[PDB]
Amino acid sequence: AAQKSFRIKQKMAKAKKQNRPLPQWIRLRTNNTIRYNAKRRNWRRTKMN
Amino acid sequence: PEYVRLQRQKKILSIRLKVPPSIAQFQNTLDRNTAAETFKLLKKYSPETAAEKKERLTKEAAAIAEGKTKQEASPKPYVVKYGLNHVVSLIENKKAKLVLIANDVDPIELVIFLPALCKKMGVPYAIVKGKARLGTLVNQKTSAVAALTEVRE
Amino acid sequence: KALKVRTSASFRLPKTLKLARSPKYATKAVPHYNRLDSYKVIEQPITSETAMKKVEDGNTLVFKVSLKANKYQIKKAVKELYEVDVLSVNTLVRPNGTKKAYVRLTADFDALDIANRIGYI
Amino acid sequence: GAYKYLEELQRKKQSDVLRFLQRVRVWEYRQKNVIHRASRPTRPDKARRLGYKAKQGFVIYRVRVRRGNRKRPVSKGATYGKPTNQGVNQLKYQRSLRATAEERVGRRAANLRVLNSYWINQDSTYKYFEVILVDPSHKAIRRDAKYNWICNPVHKHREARGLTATGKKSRGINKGHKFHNTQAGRRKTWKRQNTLSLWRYR
Amino acid sequence: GIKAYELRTKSKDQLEQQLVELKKELAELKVQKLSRPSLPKINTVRKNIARVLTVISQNQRQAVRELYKGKKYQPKDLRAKKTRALRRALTKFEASQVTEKQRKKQIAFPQRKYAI
RNA sequence: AACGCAGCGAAUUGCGAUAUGUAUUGUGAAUUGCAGAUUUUCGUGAAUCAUCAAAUCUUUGAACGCACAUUGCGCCCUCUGGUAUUCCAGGGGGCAUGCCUGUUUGAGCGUCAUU
RNA sequence: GUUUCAAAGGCCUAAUUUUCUAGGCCACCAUCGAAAGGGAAUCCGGUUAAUAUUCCGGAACCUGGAUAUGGAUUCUUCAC
RNA sequence: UUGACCUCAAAUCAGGUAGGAAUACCCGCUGAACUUAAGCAUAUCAAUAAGCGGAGGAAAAGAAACCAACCGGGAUUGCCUUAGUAACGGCGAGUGAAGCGGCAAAAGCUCAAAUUUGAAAUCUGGCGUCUUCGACGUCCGAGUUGUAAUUUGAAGAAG
């Protein structure tokens, strides 16, 4: 909202980096049952704070 | 301050109310001229300073090793008696000759009954100003009571 | 006897001899080394395609700077490491949460010549 | 034997000498604060019979507490229940005013440990008590074997749990046929005899 | 790369030069990291920075102990940690310190041995 | 509790600008999805190993200089810069509250002796 | 409850020219509360795929530090 | 004019100490109603849930101001019995112990109140030195309005 605080901007900085798809080289690991990232966020669908 | 207003009003509150005869007798204190002669006497027969006790114990250790003599060595001390529980026992057995009681003990209950005890046994006693001044002759801050028993001829 | 004369009707706290510290043992034992060093403040040189355009034209080199870094400290850090006299400093915090410091040098030192020395261009 | 004279003199409370001293002392304690530090014991005979010793470690504290009953704190006397529990004004507190006095000084002086309390004086609005304390961290109390036991970790807040002289009276812990429902423990005894004990072979 | 046992014998000034030289290598490799896909050389050099800082901190803390040895009262970090409850509780000198009346009681009538 | 750290990780698992760890001890050659070394491979030594007694430990929190929808605003000692006991910045060390034991300055015709 | 039936302090000049000591005056009192109230001082032209009263060019202004040149003032003086 | 004493203060004085967490069990305070009585008000659920304070590996209790009426037992704690009994209760519904007896385990003790009075004999801190959970020596302070030794009712003290 333009005039925002530093404590708020620090949380939104995380939300940028965490929101990204599953890297491919992890899927070739031994045992590994993971396929796609469950914890994923879109701005229209779900909100943060 | 509040502590100054307390002690000044505590002086007044005791005076305005009718005090009983048992508390009232401590106002009858020893006068200035007679008192000075008493403490001139009692500064003789005063106890040992800490250095003079160390002087005596070195003389004790010398004579015991080479001589072997206790009970007569380092003569017999003539000294003033002090401490409340210590002094009360001497008055109870008719041993004390003179007694000096303080006028400003914190609870009066401690020292109020001593005038009645000395009456029954027929012991000379005298209330005197300054619990501090009884302390000065006995290497103490405050003494409360100070009595005599033994004295030179 | 003979009271202390006093004009005022108030009574205040008389100031007393306030004594200083003089301890028998140190609480810390070992004094800690420099928290923020010259190398720790300025971390990386930024090599985006926009930054190359500023180095040639504007006479300004750009850095990725650590958080907890004043414009006094960044001016001292660049002066010590690369041996250059700095003109001005401008700083911003990126959206990802990392500080960026635009640094403009004086007319004596060329930004392009020092750029090829450090590594990138 | 000076203390024995005070032991007998204190009992004669309605005398001329003591009713004077009682009224002079009770005024002084009102002007001072609710909880405040006392320099020496007011009753020197009474203190040493409860384990007081004049040396570095032992401490005395005066304290004032309100008289009368406890009131039920519900607003406007609205209990919300059956007629049995509608009482408000005539209900009473289960611990004594000694225990209330002993606990308040414990919260102020947390580092100290409570040993005992004794009655000084009273009026219509208040009662007065003098709680004696012991410092466990001080090295005189730690080394000397007579007063070492108090320094142990099991004696942390004796006043709160009710392990003092007044506490064990209020709990009702005495040997006798009169004391069955509370003796070992009131809730402990209830928890024992309201329980179904079953073995492997019935 | 660097061994820890080699850094024990060195003086105070030698470790200070060693540390400054390692930081310059770390700075130069971070420039290479953005002009190259992969670079596992960066891992080994920053382990060596941690090795030197560990050796310097030991020599200082040893020197503080060396002067404080003998006397009462030392820094709280250098004292015995253990735990809170044991540290406040009584020592082995204390508790065992029993009164004078039960010294004479223990000597006179101790627990004697017997059979049958 | 927040925010960070892997050659390529978003989560989980570990750790704190010495950041998937450092030193110390034991075992004796791995780790492995793909790289890359290091040759350390008859060794004072591989390892996401076991072990664990020396250290590091961001910002917080009982949370402690005063505040805290603020990365807000001060004060003291100390070394280095800009001409500097007083102004500006930088590196380091400190300043909460109640209660106890002692130390040093004190307040009160509360009260004692001496000029 | 927030100035009370509290012993509630922080502001200036020398002394001393070790930089630590002396002068003094004055006194019912924390701290948070407004990105529309109060409030020290910046404008024009240019430039980016996406930023600007914040970068570049050119012209100003305030607050806090230091300080010396010119001018003014001075035989009765702090201007006519 | 100078120095004491008693009460009360101040300091970023020297050195210490208290808070929060977890809460199965343990020690206290506080305290309901649904329900049962075929209704409902004493009663019952219950001296219980929720709420508040405080501990430890255990806690509490404990060396008789006891139980008995026998040819008398002998600190506390728990298990088997006593007993669904003696009592309580709109004597309705319902509630309800303890002594002896047999076992598991057993351990006893300390202050105050007397004068060392031919010697405050006692203790904290400071400074120094050692074999450093301490010991020895020395200097102020605490304290005679009572710190050591001596004695605790089973006794015990002075000759």
UniProtKB/Swiss-Prot annotation, chain C:
Presence of keyword Acetylation: no
An example Gene Ontology biological process: translation
Upper lineage: Eukaryota, Fungi, Dikarya, Ascomycota, Saccharomycotina
Name of protein: Large ribosomal subunit protein uL23
Keyword Iron on entry: no
GO cellular-component term (any): ribosome
Superkingdom of source: Eukaryota
SS bond list: none
Keywords assigned: Ribonucleoprotein, Ribosomal protein, RNA-binding, rRNA-binding
Organism: Kluyveromyces lactis (strain ATCC 8585 / CBS 2359 / DSM 70799 / NBRC 1267 / NRRL Y-1140 / WM37) (Yeast)
Record InterPro entries: Nucleotide-bd_a/b_plait_sf, Ribosomal_uL23-like, Ribosomal_uL23/eL15/eS24_sf, Ribosomal_uL23_CS, Ribosomal_uL23_N
Gene Ontology molecular function, alphabetical: rRNA binding; structural constituent of ribosome
Database matches in Pfam families: Ribosomal_L23 (PF00276), Ribosomal_L23eN (PF03939)
